Amino acid sequence: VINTFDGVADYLQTYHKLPDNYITKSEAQALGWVASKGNLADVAPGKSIGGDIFSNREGKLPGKSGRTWREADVNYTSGFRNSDRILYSSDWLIYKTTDHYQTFTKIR
Numbered sequence: 001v002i003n004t005f006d007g008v009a010d011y012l013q014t015y016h017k018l019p020d021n022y023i024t025k026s027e028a029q030a031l032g033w034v035a036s037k038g039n040l041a042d043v044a045p046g047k048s049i050g051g052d053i054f055s056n057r058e059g060k061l062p063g064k065s066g067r068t069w070r071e072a073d074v075n076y077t078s079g080f081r082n083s084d085r086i087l088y089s090s091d092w093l094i095y096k097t098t099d100h101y102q103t104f105t106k107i108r
Contacts, residue, residue, distance in 0.1 A: 003048050005074050008086050009094045009108045016092075018072055022050030041078030048076040054087060060104055061087060061095060 002011055002019040011019050023031070023044065032043040040047065050072030054061075061069055068090040075084045087095040087104060094108035 001046065003074055003076060005084075005086060005096050005107060008050075008072060008074055009088075009096075012086075012088050012094065013092050013108060018050050021047055022072055023047050024051045025049055038080035040076075040081070048073045049081060054101075058101070060101070061089075062093065064091075067091060 001021050002008055003021060008019065025033075028040060028044060028047070028049055033040050033049075040049065051070060054069040054071040056063060056069050070088055072086045072088070073081055073084065074086050074096070076082055083098060083100045085097045085101065086107075087097065092108070093106070095104040096107050097104050
């Protein structure tokens with residue numbers, strides 16, 4: 001049950017995977033997550049959307065041969081998804097955004 005910037009960053013770097021409270025978007029849709037309805041905490045209490053590949057096409061995050069970027073929602077409790085996201089690479093560089101991928105800051 002970890003969903004803070006430090007909690008998830010630390011977890012990833014140490015255990016090389018997201019904490020157990022995360023599910024991908026297709027998983028949550030399968031489970032009855034309806035975006036426009038803001039009902040995640042309704043169909044999946046205690047769960048956050050996380051683990052999907054992030055394309056990086058605005059090209060704002062540092063790229064590299066064979067490097068993959070993935071994202072996870074941070075600070076989510078209920079209702080519509082918020083604007084906080086942790087971004088992590090295949091090689092464990094960790095960045096965060098608090099304005100829907102507009103700007104990023106390195107945190108690890």
